[PDB]
């Protein structure tokens, strides 16, 4: 029984190689998540087929319709069996899907155009000269929406009532916007993606300040599935064997086409 | 029914209060773990009684007897209901108990005695003889050890990495023994060995010991791996999911970060 | 019963919102005074309707008619129940209305156009032609004026200090008139007079105007006196003591401090 | 009828006369508050007799007995007709006595021994190596006790549970303690007293940071008295005529027995 593996096109997690037109099956995808899925399948011992989520959404709930979209939606509604992808572990997701142990620590970080005047998030909220937003229907926007801290509350209140739409549909759109804004825009995204972008050409983006919080990516399965314990054990074994460290070093720092 | 919580006597997780010779109950202990347990009880309502393991060990499987000891061992046999303590999530422990999501990140680091400032135009520089684990294993004048019945010892024993295997081979055949009974004993050995002893402990304890007086120890290199601390629940128990969601809520509301900052960096003696 | 609150259109106390054409009710206005009114209504439960005086004056006595005008005047005759606005507590006003305890300190300051950074090694220095009220009165090249029907004009009219008396004598016999009908008009005169006009206004508005773009104005010297802003109330009204208690309570909680920091410092630039 | 005036020996508000052994009446007292009382009597037109409060406390409520001590007690219980003294206007006091308009602005300040490693009160709260307390039965301890701010809550919790007693019976004891502590103790007191102390010899104490909050001194009268409105009008007249500024300049900066 082939296991359906939903995932999203995120770099360096999943990429469509370079000559994908002449390739078929899972051989046309490469990245950290592809390697993670291969190791998970090797440990558990199942045949899998990588599938790309129909909409480029990680997963959230719509305007009071209680419907999950993106990867979480495909998991809940039975459209997929497992999600090896950068899915942040959150409160709202955990109640509906089974998350494994985190395979990568991360956090929310500020990235800007290349002594920065903002540095910390407090100064970023205080100064209204520079605009800042998040990814639409992701996890950072939900973190800001439900945040009770005064600084994050001010951040979310400004971001929601902003003209034009300060949010972006895809993280690539966000990095393009912050590159083209001539330093007038700040992008809020995961620390791992921030470091990957800052370690790539043309190296015009830099990460400033610290991490707003601490989160992690987990392998998600439908609630009440038989694969949750095996994939949890496989993630633990991979972490203890250094496989996750090796994969992150390969896909984040082995190439390093940046000047640092 | 009041459940029993087990914890280890580790700072700044659970430390006896100053006036603890006359106090009774959970008010005797202060630290990160006590008010973490308070927050857990506040989220999901239950009555808890803090307890300390008699052996004072974190937990490991004994060879040729397959008997778990320490916090994990006493949690398996049913004399505890929940382990809110700096217990490291491992593969061996996950097959006998249930671990929640990590509430604090950590890693294996190296602790050494802080060298004196180098004299040479008038700038002072810090020169250290060990800067990573590769050169720590490649030398012989400095002994290094871990904590017995801990996660680090099991990690080094079961590691297939070349440098980690070399360090494990060194500490296995070491005379006198480089293993310590308690973290505080390891720090005492580090401060007493005049700079010839390195301690392989967790990064959180290393940073906490660095921040407090007499601050004669330093952390060299990065972490050897990435791990986490989880709240341990007996396998097949009713306190697993509520505790996991409680940890998730405390992470999302910022309680964990504020607790860490007020228990590690607020009391920055040095 | 819904009581009517009067206020003046003075930044940052009350400013029309950007989308104020379609919005109705108290949501039209934003600023320090609307937040103060909300807090006052939260202290003691009552419904309020924000209003703006038609004449747009703070309040003064007319010549030879002994008739009050402005916010104070319309509060005396009973067309308003409470004045939550930057109304300065004075002796003449206290004899006809009731003032609560000051909710913000202030003083009379001098506003001039900011000069250019002077150069002579390669350091830029700030050189100003006026640095006190004494040298402002002694000099004659730069004209100075105040706000019509304001507290500062009454202070200068009834001042027995030699310097203040000289300045008032200059203002009375001034051609063309140095008095402005609105604070914004005075700042516009300062900006467009290219350094030949000095505005004598309240310290809070002076700092607020200095803190925003294009920030071509500067405050010279210190405050000529010390005063405060109070919430006015008609004599013998039931709203006096509850509002005074509310102001004291908001001072104790530090709500006034955070309102000031949010409406004066956070929104500033340059 | 001679109006009884209660006051406390505080410098430079009320000071004992140099040759007071040979003097009697109100001519044996001098200071800012003595001049204030003289101006109030001149404006209202009443004869007064300055009386020193029995216990050197400004006023507070005791441990669950609802009894006012100090000057507020003398006012409430009919033992005094008016209080021209540095009495801080507070919500708890206003409910039992009638304050006039503030005749002097002030705030909580941090005063230490003369690199300045303390800065604002945030660092003072985050630091456990330096001791700091307040005046007992005053208004600063009440402000710290009822404060709902996290920094001030931490300050109060540390101060109450401190061994030995971090509080001082009189402000002079506090300044002596901070002088003799070799920089290990900090004293929290009113900004006016802090400035007066640092401006007088030996000038070994210096102020750091800004004022914690803003308060003021008002002339207190018994509730439901006929003197409240006349003294309020007199205070307003004195403020308008510059008499209060003149007296502050006379008693704070006119001597200036310091090098600054
Ligand atoms: N260095 S890293 O970001 O690639 C990374 C991060 C993490 C890893 C492993 C790696 Cl390699 N494993 C941990 C897991 C292992 C066991 C202990 C904590 C969880 C359960 N999660 S983690 O702390 O999020
Ligand atoms: N900054 S820290 O080490 O005290 C720390 C570390 C971690 C926190 C929260 C804090 Cl405050 N929460 C995460 C949890 C939240 C969700 C995502 C990963 C786990 C499940 N684990 S963590 O990445 O191990
Ligand atoms: N810092 S400020 O100008 O916003 C400011 C100014 C003042 C505040 C509070 C603040 Cl936050 N409260 C005082 C009041 C409190 C009690 C003592 C004096 C009045 C009654 N008035 S004040 O001295 O005019
Ligand atoms: N410069 S000072 O501290 O001596 C000082 C302080 C103050 C003065 C007068 C002086 Cl001289 N008057 C004001 C009062 C006057 C009118 C306006 C506010 C109150 C009512 N209170 S105050 O703002 O506390
Ligand atoms: N990776 C996040 C979204 C990225 C972001 O919000 O910055 C998720 O799983 O939803
Ligand atoms: N925290 C570790 C013990 C400390 C160590 O091994 O350094 C554990 O849970 O096993
Ligand atoms: N705030 C002053 C008016 C402003 C001014 O006179 O500068 C008043 O209440 O009268
Ligand atoms: N002046 C204050 C007391 C001074 C202090 O506590 O520092 C009062 O009236 O209570």
mmCIF file of C-alpha atoms in Angstrom, chain D residues 77-241:
data_model
loop_
_atom_site.group_PDB
_atom_site.id
_atom_site.type_symbol
_atom_site.label_atom_id
_atom_site.label_comp_id
_atom_site.label_asym_id
_atom_site.label_seq_id
_atom_site.Cartn_x
_atom_site.Cartn_y
_atom_site.Cartn_z
ATOM 1 C CA UNK D 77 -9.436 63.013 64.348
ATOM 2 C CA UNK D 78 -9.822 66.783 64.732
ATOM 3 C CA UNK D 79 -6.389 67.270 66.311
ATOM 4 C CA UNK D 80 -5.365 69.741 63.580
ATOM 5 C CA UNK D 81 -7.121 72.279 61.366
ATOM 6 C CA UNK D 82 -4.704 72.209 58.398
ATOM 7 C CA UNK D 83 -1.461 70.544 57.283
ATOM 8 C CA UNK D 84 1.040 72.706 55.395
ATOM 9 C CA UNK D 85 3.679 70.021 54.867
ATOM 10 C CA UNK D 86 5.115 67.845 52.077
ATOM 11 C CA UNK D 87 2.048 65.583 52.083
ATOM 12 C CA UNK D 88 1.818 63.563 48.872
ATOM 13 C CA UNK D 89 -1.608 63.492 47.228
ATOM 14 C CA UNK D 90 -2.819 59.889 47.072
ATOM 15 C CA UNK D 91 -6.109 58.151 46.349
ATOM 16 C CA UNK D 92 -6.304 56.517 49.786
ATOM 17 C CA UNK D 93 -5.703 59.855 51.518
ATOM 18 C CA UNK D 94 -8.088 61.830 49.293
ATOM 19 C CA UNK D 95 -11.045 59.716 50.435
ATOM 20 C CA UNK D 96 -10.542 60.828 54.057
ATOM 21 C CA UNK D 97 -9.060 64.359 53.763
ATOM 22 C CA UNK D 98 -9.418 67.233 51.307
ATOM 23 C CA UNK D 99 -6.259 68.062 49.367
ATOM 24 C CA UNK D 100 -5.716 71.397 47.662
ATOM 25 C CA UNK D 101 -4.080 71.908 44.282
ATOM 26 C CA UNK D 102 -0.478 70.630 44.164
ATOM 27 C CA UNK D 103 2.051 73.287 45.149
ATOM 28 C CA UNK D 104 5.086 71.224 44.074
ATOM 29 C CA UNK D 105 5.657 68.474 41.515
ATOM 30 C CA UNK D 106 7.811 65.463 42.344
ATOM 31 C CA UNK D 107 8.266 61.741 41.813
ATOM 32 C CA UNK D 108 9.984 58.603 43.032
ATOM 33 C CA UNK D 109 13.749 58.771 42.522
ATOM 34 C CA UNK D 110 16.727 56.472 43.074
ATOM 35 C CA UNK D 111 19.584 57.987 45.084
ATOM 36 C CA UNK D 112 22.892 56.196 45.665
ATOM 37 C CA UNK D 113 26.484 56.765 46.684
ATOM 38 C CA UNK D 114 28.569 58.817 44.252
ATOM 39 C CA UNK D 115 30.453 54.231 35.952
ATOM 40 C CA UNK D 116 26.799 54.273 37.098
ATOM 41 C CA UNK D 117 25.988 50.544 36.749
ATOM 42 C CA UNK D 118 22.377 50.985 37.915
ATOM 43 C CA UNK D 119 20.698 53.173 35.250
ATOM 44 C CA UNK D 120 16.904 52.866 35.289
ATOM 45 C CA UNK D 121 14.761 51.072 37.860
ATOM 46 C CA UNK D 122 14.472 48.057 35.540
ATOM 47 C CA UNK D 123 18.150 47.236 36.069
ATOM 48 C CA UNK D 124 17.681 47.908 39.785
ATOM 49 C CA UNK D 125 14.930 45.277 39.897
ATOM 50 C CA UNK D 126 17.007 42.855 37.809
ATOM 51 C CA UNK D 127 19.976 43.339 40.178
ATOM 52 C CA UNK D 128 20.162 41.465 43.490
ATOM 53 C CA UNK D 129 23.604 42.673 44.619
ATOM 54 C CA UNK D 130 22.423 46.138 45.741
ATOM 55 C CA UNK D 131 19.891 46.679 48.526
ATOM 56 C CA UNK D 132 17.121 49.256 48.272
ATOM 57 C CA UNK D 133 14.220 50.305 50.474
ATOM 58 C CA UNK D 134 11.901 53.188 51.268
ATOM 59 C CA UNK D 135 10.505 55.312 54.099
ATOM 60 C CA UNK D 136 8.169 53.454 56.439
ATOM 61 C CA UNK D 137 4.561 54.611 56.908
ATOM 62 C CA UNK D 138 5.068 57.102 54.067
ATOM 63 C CA UNK D 139 3.618 57.280 50.571
ATOM 64 C CA UNK D 140 6.335 55.510 48.559
ATOM 65 C CA UNK D 141 5.879 52.198 50.381
ATOM 66 C CA UNK D 142 2.136 52.441 49.744
ATOM 67 C CA UNK D 143 2.795 53.152 46.065
ATOM 68 C CA UNK D 144 5.032 50.088 45.771
ATOM 69 C CA UNK D 145 2.674 47.829 47.736
ATOM 70 C CA UNK D 146 -0.435 48.581 45.653
ATOM 71 C CA UNK D 147 1.424 48.795 42.331
ATOM 72 C CA UNK D 148 0.257 46.306 39.700
ATOM 73 C CA UNK D 149 3.288 46.799 37.430
ATOM 74 C CA UNK D 150 5.561 43.771 37.122
ATOM 75 C CA UNK D 151 8.781 45.673 37.859
ATOM 76 C CA UNK D 152 7.244 47.412 40.871
ATOM 77 C CA UNK D 153 5.616 44.154 41.980
ATOM 78 C CA UNK D 154 9.050 42.505 41.976
ATOM 79 C CA UNK D 155 10.479 45.516 43.816
ATOM 80 C CA UNK D 156 7.815 45.339 46.530
ATOM 81 C CA UNK D 157 8.087 41.558 46.903
ATOM 82 C CA UNK D 158 11.847 41.795 47.390
ATOM 83 C CA UNK D 159 11.583 44.777 49.751
ATOM 84 C CA UNK D 160 8.966 43.277 52.076
ATOM 85 C CA UNK D 161 10.783 39.930 52.404
ATOM 86 C CA UNK D 162 14.239 41.311 53.160
ATOM 87 C CA UNK D 163 16.528 40.678 56.135
ATOM 88 C CA UNK D 164 17.396 42.967 57.862
ATOM 89 C CA UNK D 165 14.710 45.665 57.623
ATOM 90 C CA UNK D 166 15.346 47.590 54.405
ATOM 91 C CA UNK D 167 13.053 50.422 55.546
ATOM 92 C CA UNK D 168 14.110 53.531 57.462
ATOM 93 C CA UNK D 169 12.132 55.324 60.159
ATOM 94 C CA UNK D 170 13.182 58.761 58.866
ATOM 95 C CA UNK D 171 14.602 60.056 55.593
ATOM 96 C CA UNK D 172 17.731 61.249 57.414
ATOM 97 C CA UNK D 173 18.337 57.663 58.518
ATOM 98 C CA UNK D 174 17.946 56.628 54.883
ATOM 99 C CA UNK D 175 20.495 59.128 53.587
ATOM 100 C CA UNK D 176 22.890 58.156 56.383
ATOM 101 C CA UNK D 177 22.465 54.488 55.461
ATOM 102 C CA UNK D 178 23.088 55.056 51.749
ATOM 103 C CA UNK D 179 26.141 57.190 52.554
ATOM 104 C CA UNK D 180 27.642 54.677 54.997
ATOM 105 C CA UNK D 181 26.863 51.586 52.888
ATOM 106 C CA UNK D 182 29.868 52.133 50.563
ATOM 107 C CA UNK D 183 27.582 52.058 47.532
ATOM 108 C CA UNK D 184 25.869 48.776 48.435
ATOM 109 C CA UNK D 185 22.522 50.394 49.352
ATOM 110 C CA UNK D 186 20.053 52.497 47.372
ATOM 111 C CA UNK D 187 17.420 54.827 48.823
ATOM 112 C CA UNK D 188 14.057 55.460 47.161
ATOM 113 C CA UNK D 189 12.569 58.834 48.073
ATOM 114 C CA UNK D 190 10.894 61.929 46.665
ATOM 115 C CA UNK D 191 12.646 63.775 43.851
ATOM 116 C CA UNK D 192 12.612 67.097 45.721
ATOM 117 C CA UNK D 193 14.352 65.671 48.793
ATOM 118 C CA UNK D 194 16.809 63.841 46.534
ATOM 119 C CA UNK D 195 17.735 67.069 44.739
ATOM 120 C CA UNK D 196 18.016 69.004 48.004
ATOM 121 C CA UNK D 197 20.289 66.332 49.490
ATOM 122 C CA UNK D 198 22.532 66.071 46.429
ATOM 123 C CA UNK D 199 22.818 69.875 46.335
ATOM 124 C CA UNK D 200 24.108 70.056 49.936
ATOM 125 C CA UNK D 201 27.471 69.137 51.421
ATOM 126 C CA UNK D 202 29.176 66.692 51.425
ATOM 127 C CA UNK D 203 27.406 66.025 48.079
ATOM 128 C CA UNK D 204 28.347 62.338 48.225
ATOM 129 C CA UNK D 205 24.923 61.223 46.921
ATOM 130 C CA UNK D 206 23.775 61.428 43.303
ATOM 131 C CA UNK D 207 20.508 60.789 41.473
ATOM 132 C CA UNK D 208 20.242 58.211 38.690
ATOM 133 C CA UNK D 209 17.542 57.583 36.126
ATOM 134 C CA UNK D 210 14.279 59.459 35.881
ATOM 135 C CA UNK D 211 11.263 59.842 38.117
ATOM 136 C CA UNK D 212 9.322 56.599 38.485
ATOM 137 C CA UNK D 213 5.949 58.376 38.539
ATOM 138 C CA UNK D 214 4.518 61.876 38.924
ATOM 139 C CA UNK D 215 2.857 63.084 42.132
ATOM 140 C CA UNK D 216 2.534 66.321 44.090
ATOM 141 C CA UNK D 217 2.324 67.899 47.520
ATOM 142 C CA UNK D 218 -1.001 69.404 48.528
ATOM 143 C CA UNK D 219 -2.231 71.309 51.555
ATOM 144 C CA UNK D 220 -4.475 68.859 53.398
ATOM 145 C CA UNK D 221 -7.520 69.914 55.418
ATOM 146 C CA UNK D 222 -10.128 67.857 57.298
ATOM 147 C CA UNK D 223 -12.952 66.623 55.104
ATOM 148 C CA UNK D 224 -15.985 68.894 55.112
ATOM 149 C CA UNK D 225 -14.081 71.949 56.356
ATOM 150 C CA UNK D 226 -14.672 75.605 55.533
ATOM 151 C CA UNK D 227 -10.978 76.253 54.791
ATOM 152 C CA UNK D 228 -10.548 74.011 51.739
ATOM 153 C CA UNK D 229 -11.745 76.471 49.107
ATOM 154 C CA UNK D 230 -9.843 79.508 50.510
ATOM 155 C CA UNK D 231 -6.581 77.556 50.738
ATOM 156 C CA UNK D 232 -7.082 76.136 47.239
ATOM 157 C CA UNK D 233 -7.598 79.665 45.912
ATOM 158 C CA UNK D 234 -4.540 80.861 47.842
ATOM 159 C CA UNK D 235 -2.419 78.067 46.349
ATOM 160 C CA UNK D 236 -3.628 78.989 42.859
ATOM 161 C CA UNK D 237 -2.863 82.672 43.479
ATOM 162 C CA UNK D 238 0.613 81.843 44.791
ATOM 163 C CA UNK D 239 1.298 79.686 41.732
ATOM 164 C CA UNK D 240 0.132 82.445 39.383
ATOM 165 C CA UNK D 241 2.156 85.150 41.160
#
